[PDB]
Amino acid sequence: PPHLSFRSFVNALRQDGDLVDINEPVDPDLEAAAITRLVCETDDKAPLFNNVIGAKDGLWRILGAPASLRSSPKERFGRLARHLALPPTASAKDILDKMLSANSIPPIEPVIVPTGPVKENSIEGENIDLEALPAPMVHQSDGGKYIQTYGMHVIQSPDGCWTNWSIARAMVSGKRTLAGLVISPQHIRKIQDQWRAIGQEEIPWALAFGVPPTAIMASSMPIPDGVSEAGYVGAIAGEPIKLVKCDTNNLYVPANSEIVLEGTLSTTKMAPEGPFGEMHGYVYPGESHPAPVYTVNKITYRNNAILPMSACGRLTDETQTMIGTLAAAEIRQLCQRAGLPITDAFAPFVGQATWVALKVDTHRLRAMKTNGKAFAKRVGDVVFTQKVGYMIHRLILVGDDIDVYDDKDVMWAFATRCRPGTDEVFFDDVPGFWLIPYMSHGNAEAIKGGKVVSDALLTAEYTTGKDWESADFKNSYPKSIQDKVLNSWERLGFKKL
Amino acid sequence: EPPHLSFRSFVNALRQDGDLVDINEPVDPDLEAAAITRLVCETDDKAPLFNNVIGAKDGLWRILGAPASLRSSPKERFGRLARHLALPPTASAKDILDKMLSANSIPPIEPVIVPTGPVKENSIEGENIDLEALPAPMVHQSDGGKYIQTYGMHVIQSPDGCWTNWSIARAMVSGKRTLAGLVISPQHIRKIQDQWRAIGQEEIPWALAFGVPPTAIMASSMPIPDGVSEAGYVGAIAGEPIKLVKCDTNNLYVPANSEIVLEGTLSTTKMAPEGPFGEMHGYVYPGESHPAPVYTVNKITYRNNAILPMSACGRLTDETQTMIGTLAAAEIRQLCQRAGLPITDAFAPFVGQATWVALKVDTHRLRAMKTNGKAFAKRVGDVVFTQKVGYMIHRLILVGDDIDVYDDKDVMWAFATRCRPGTDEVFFDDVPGFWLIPYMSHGNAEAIKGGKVVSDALLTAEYTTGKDWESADFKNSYPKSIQDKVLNSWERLGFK
Ligand SMILES: Cc1cc2c3c(c1C)C(C)(C)C[C@H]1C[C@@H](C)[C@]4(C(=O)NC(=O)N=C4N2C[C@H](O)[C@H](O)[C@H](O)COP(=O)(O)O)N31
Ligand SMILES: Cc1cc2c3c(c1C)C(C)(C)C[C@H]1C[C@@H](C)[C@]4(C(=O)NC(=O)N=C4N2C[C@H](O)[C@H](O)[C@H](O)COP(=O)(O)O)N31
Ligand SMILES: [K+]
Ligand SMILES: [K+]
Ligand SMILES: [K+]
Ligand SMILES: [K+]
Ligand SMILES: [Mn+2]
Numbered sequence A: 001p002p003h004l005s006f007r008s009f010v011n012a013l014r015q016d017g018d019l020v021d022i023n024e025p026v027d028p029d030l031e032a033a034a035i036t037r038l039v040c041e042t043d044d045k046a047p048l049f050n051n052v053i054g055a056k057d058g059l060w061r062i063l064g065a066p067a068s069l070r071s072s073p074k075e076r077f078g079r080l081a082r083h084l085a086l087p088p089t090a091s092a093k094d095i096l097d098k099m100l101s102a103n104s105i106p107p108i109e110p111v112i113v114p115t116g117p118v119k120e121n122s123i124e125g126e127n128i129d130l131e132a133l134p135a136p137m138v139h140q141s142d143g144g145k146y147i148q149t150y151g152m153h154v155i156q157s158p159d160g161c162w163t164n165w166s167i168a169r170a171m172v173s174g175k176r177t178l179a180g181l182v183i184s185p186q187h188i189r190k191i192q193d194q195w196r197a198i199g200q201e202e203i204p205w206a207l208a209f210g211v212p213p214t215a216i217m218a219s220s221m222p223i224p225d226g227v228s229e230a231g232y233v234g235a236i237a238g239e240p241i242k243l244v245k246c247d248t249n250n251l252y253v254p255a256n257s258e259i260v261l262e263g264t265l266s267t268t269k270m271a272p273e274g275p276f277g278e279m280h281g282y283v284y285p286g287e288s289h290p291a292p293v294y295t296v297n298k299i300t301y302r303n304n305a306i307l308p309m310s311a312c313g314r315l316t317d318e319t320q321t322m323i324g325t326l327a328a329a330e331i332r333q334l335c336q337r338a339g340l341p342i343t344d345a346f347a348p349f350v351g352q353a354t355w356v357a358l359k360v361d362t363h364r365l366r367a368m369k370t371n372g373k374a375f376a377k378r379v380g381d382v383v384f385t386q387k388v389g390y391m392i393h394r395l396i397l398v399g400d401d402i403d404v405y406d407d408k409d410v411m412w413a414f415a416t417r418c419r420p421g422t423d424e425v426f427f428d429d430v431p432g433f434w435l436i437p438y439m440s441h442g443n444a445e446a447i448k449g450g451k452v453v454s455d456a457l458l459t460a461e462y463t464t465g466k467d468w469e470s471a472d473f474k475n476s477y478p479k480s481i482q483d484k485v486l487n488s489w490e491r492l493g494f495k496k497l
Numbered sequence B: 001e002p003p004h005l006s007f008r009s010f011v012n013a014l015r016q017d018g019d020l021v022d023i024n025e026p027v028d029p030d031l032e033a034a035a036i037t038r039l040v041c042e043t044d045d046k047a048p049l050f051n052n053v054i055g056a057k058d059g060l061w062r063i064l065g066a067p068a069s070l071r072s073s074p075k076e077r078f079g080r081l082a083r084h085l086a087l088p089p090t091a092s093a094k095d096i097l098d099k100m101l102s103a104n105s106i107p108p109i110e111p112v113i114v115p116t117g118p119v120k121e122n123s124i125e126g127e128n129i130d131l132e133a134l135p136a137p138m139v140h141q142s143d144g145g146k147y148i149q150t151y152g153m154h155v156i157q158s159p160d161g162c163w164t165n166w167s168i169a170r171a172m173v174s175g176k177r178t179l180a181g182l183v184i185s186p187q188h189i190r191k192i193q194d195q196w197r198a199i200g201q202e203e204i205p206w207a208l209a210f211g212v213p214p215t216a217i218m219a220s221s222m223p224i225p226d227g228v229s230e231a232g233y234v235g236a237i238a239g240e241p242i243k244l245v246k247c248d249t250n251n252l253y254v255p256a257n258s259e260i261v262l263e264g265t266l267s268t269t270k271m272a273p274e275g276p277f278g279e280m281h282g283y284v285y286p287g288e289s290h291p292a293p294v295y296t297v298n299k300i301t302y303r304n305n306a307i308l309p310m311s312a313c314g315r316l317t318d319e320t321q322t323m324i325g326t327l328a329a330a331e332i333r334q335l336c337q338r339a340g341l342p343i344t345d346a347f348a349p350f351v352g353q354a355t356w357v358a359l360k361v362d363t364h365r366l367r368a369m370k371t372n373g374k375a376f377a378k379r380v381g382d383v384v385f386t387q388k389v390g391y392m393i394h395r396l397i398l399v400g401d402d403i404d405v406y407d408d409k410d411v412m413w414a415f416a417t418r419c420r421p422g423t424d425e426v427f428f429d430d431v432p433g434f435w436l437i438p439y440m441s442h443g444n445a446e447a448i449k450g451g452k453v454v455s456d457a458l459l460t461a462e463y464t465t466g467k468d469w470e471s472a473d474f475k476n477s478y479p480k481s482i483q484d485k486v487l488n489s490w491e492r493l494g495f496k
C-alpha cells in the first residue's frame, strides 16, 4: 500500500491527480529544483522528473515536493495524508494524531526478508563516482549538490539495540564521500558520539532514499531517545516494515527502498559542508562549516529508481509541513505528560517552523488555579529544556476558542491577547537553534537563548472564564439570524460560501 | 460629480465595478443587515446596499454596508478604497496611502460655500425628531445600543473658529434626541471638547454628516496634524474644493451632497451610558458600558433616497483594519522622516489586527549612521510612541528594504526569522497605551499605559556591512536563464 512503498505512493499521487510526469529532459543542475521550488510556492502538483539529464543505468528519476501542500483547501494536506494511510481530506490534526498514535501502543517490530526491489541493481567500490551521478543543485548558492534532502539515515548504537532513522541534509563532497549535518541534540549525533567514546573511527551507516512513506515521516519526528523508529513505524501502520540486510554491513534497510547507500559515518574526519538554502528561507553564499564525512562503499537500487528531493526555503515545503509540525506534535505530548492542560499544538506556517501554538483546556486551567505569568514560565521550562523543543523559539499559549491549526486564529489571539513584554517570559539560558538567522547571524550567542513563551490567554481565562464574545458572524449574531443570512446568501447575489 | 466627491456617485461606481449587491428584499436593521455585512467582510464579497430596510419611513433610510472593505480578486483587492480617492480599482495599498499623504506637501484647497445642495432636500426638526424610531442598526447582538454612527464624519470647531475637525468616532442612539459616543484622548474631537470645557461652554456646536464625499471620509480616519482643518487637506487630495453648505441651526458647514446630516451640540457636562460595541480588534464585552458624552440632535436634513453607511466592524477584514492602522502607518512614516530616521515606507499588516505597523528602512542610509538595532529600536519607539499618530499601535516591526511592508507574508517572514525574541526588542512601559485592546483593558497591567514594543527585524550585518544572504525562493535562488526556461515550460508541462 502507498504508506508502505514509495513506488506505490508515487502512483497514489498520480491516481489523485497530484503528480505531473515530466518526460522532457530536465537538468538536475538547478532546473529540477527551480520547478520544485515554484510548485512549493504555489501549492501545485508534485513534479516527477522521469528524464533527468545525466541519468545512467536507472540512476535516477527525481520526485520533487514529496510532502508539500495541495491547492484545494479541502485536500490541502493530501500529499502528507498519502504518507500515512489517511484520506486526502485529512486535517493537520488527523496527521499529527496518527503520528503520535504509536507512542501509547507496543511497537510492531520489523520483519526480515532475504531480498527486495532495492537489490535489483548495484554499483560497488571503485565503480562508484558520486560526482558523475545526477545529484541536484538545489539552490544556486549551495556549497554542493544536495543528493540528500529526503532520505533516511540508518545508524545503530554500539550495543546493537537502538537503530535510529532520521533525515539530515548531505551533499556530495567527492567521488566516494558526502558531507552532512550531524548536530546536537539529534539522535544521529548522540549515536555518533557513543561510537566516538569507544574509539570507533568509521561507524556502519546506510542512507535509504524513497523509503516507505510512514518511515520518512517518523524519520522527521523527534520520537523518544533510544526508541528505534522501525517499531514505531510498524505501530503507526499496524503491520511490520519489511527490511533487508545491507550487503556490505550488518544494518537493515526497507526492502522496497528506491536507492540505498551503504558505508560509514566518520568520528574523525570532517569536510566543508554547506551553505544550503534552508528551512527558514535563507542561504548564506560562501558560508561553509565543517561537517562529518560519510563514505559510500556500495549503492543498491530499484529498476527505474526515484530520488526524492525537498527544494526547501520560503513557504511551503517539507521543512515546514513536517519539521515544525512533528515537533509540535511531540511538544503537545510532552506538555500533557508534564501535567499541563494542553489539548493540541501546531507550528503555524507564518512562524517559518520556529513557532508552536499550544491550545489550552481552559476548564482544566481554571481548576489548576494559576496565572499567565507563572504558567508561561512553567511551559517554557517544560519544553525548552527538552530535545523536542530545540528548534522552536516562540510558544504561543491560546485558549480553546482558538483553532491552533489556523494561522489566522493564532495571529488574532497573539496580536490581541498577549501584551508585548508584560505577558511574555523570555529564556536566555536554554539551547537555541543556531540555524535561525537571528541566532547565528544575530546580536547574541548563536547556540543559547532567544526563546519566549507568549501568554495569549486573557487574564479572566485563568480565573472566572471567558467574558467576551467575538465580533464575527459566528459569535455576534444569533443562530436564527445566521440561518436567515445563509439561506438568502446566493439568491441575493453573494458568492457561494 | 465624480465618485471621490459624492457618496451617491461612489455607490454607482461600485455598482458599475460589479462590487455592489442591491438588496431589494426586506432586511431587518436589528442584526440582519449587520450580519450580512459581517459575512461580506469575512469573505471579501461585494458591498451590500440595503434598499428595503424594515422600519424605514419618510426617506430614512437605506444602508450601505462594508463601504471600504476588501474585494476578493487579488488584482483589485483595494478597489473599494481606490474608488474613494479617484484611483484605479487595481491601485496598491501603497498607491492609496501615498495619495492620502500627497496633501502633506501641497497647499490646502479651501472648501467653497454653496447656498444649498441635495442634503437640504428633506428635514425633521426639534420635537418631530425621534432617534429611537429611526431604523438605526443593531450592529452586534451584545452592543449596548443601536450604533447609528460607524461611518459618518463628526464636524466640530475650536473656540477661535480657525480649526474645524472632521473625524470618525462611534456613537449610538441614547434617547429621543440624543446620541452617546466615544470622545477619547488623544483624538481631536476630545481636544476640541476640552478647549470648550475650559472656557465654560456647556453645549458645543456640532454636526454629524453621513455619506460624505468619499475623499472626506478617508481624511476623517487619518491623523493629520493638530490644528489642521481636514476640509482643505481633502481639497488638496481631490484636486478641487469640497462644496460645503452651512447647517440650518448652527454656524458649522457640511458637505452639500451628504446623504444625512444631524445638527446639534456636544455637551461638555452631560454623560450617558455608552457601549459596549463590537470593535476593531474583534471583541465585544457584553454588559460593559462606560459613561460617554451626550450629543443632542436639533435638526436632521437629508437627501431623497438617503443612504446610511455602516461599518460592521470586528474580525478581519473591515474599515477599521483597511483605514485606521493603515492611515496611522502613513502618518508614522512621515513622523519618522521629519525626525530624520531612515524610514521609506510603512503599513499596518492585517495579521496585527490594526495594532502592528511595519517600517521599511533605507539600509544604505542606515549603514551611514554606524548604529545597532538595540539603539535604533529605542529611538524609533521614543519618537512614535509619544505622538498621537502612534497611540493605537502597540508593535512596530523594523524591516530592511528587501521586505515588502505591504505584504503580510514578507513581514511575518522577516519578524519570525530576523528578530530574536526579547534580545532584539525594546519594550515601552511608560507610554500611552490603547486601552481598547483586550490585553490592555482586560489584561495584567495598567489599561492606559505601556504594553508596547519595537521589534528589530533587521539582521545584524544590515547595520554594518550589508545584506549577506539570498532568499531560498524562486525569485532569488535560481538564475534568470533557469527562471525563464521554467516559466516558458510551466503550463505546457501541466502546472497551473
Ligand atoms: C523533513 C526534513 C527534516 C530535516 C531536514 C530536512 C527535511 C526535509 C532537510 C534535509 C531538507 C533540511 C534540513 C534542515 C535540518 C533541520 C535537517 C538537517 O539537516 N539536520 C537535522 O538535524 N535535522 C534536519 N531535519 C529534521 C530532523 O529530521 C528531525 O529533527 C528528526 O526528529 C531527527 O530525528 P531524531 O529525532 O531521530 O534525531 N534537515
Ligand atoms: C474608520 C474608522 C475610524 C475610527 C472608528 C471607526 C471607523 C470605521 C468605527 C466607528 C467603526 C469604530 C471606532 C473604533 C475607534 C478607534 C473609533 C472611535 O470610535 N473613536 C475614535 O476616536 N477613533 C475611531 N476611529 C479612528 C479615527 O477616525 C482616527 O483615529 C482619526 O484620525 C481621528 O481624527 P482626528 O485625527 O482628527 O482626531 N472608531
Ligand atoms: K526520527
Ligand atoms: K495575556
Ligand atoms: K481626521
Ligand atoms: K535583529
Ligand atoms: Mn530518533
Ligand SMILES: [Mn+2]
Binding pocket: B165, B166, B167, B188, B223, B224, B225, B226, B228, B230
Ligand atoms: Mn484632525
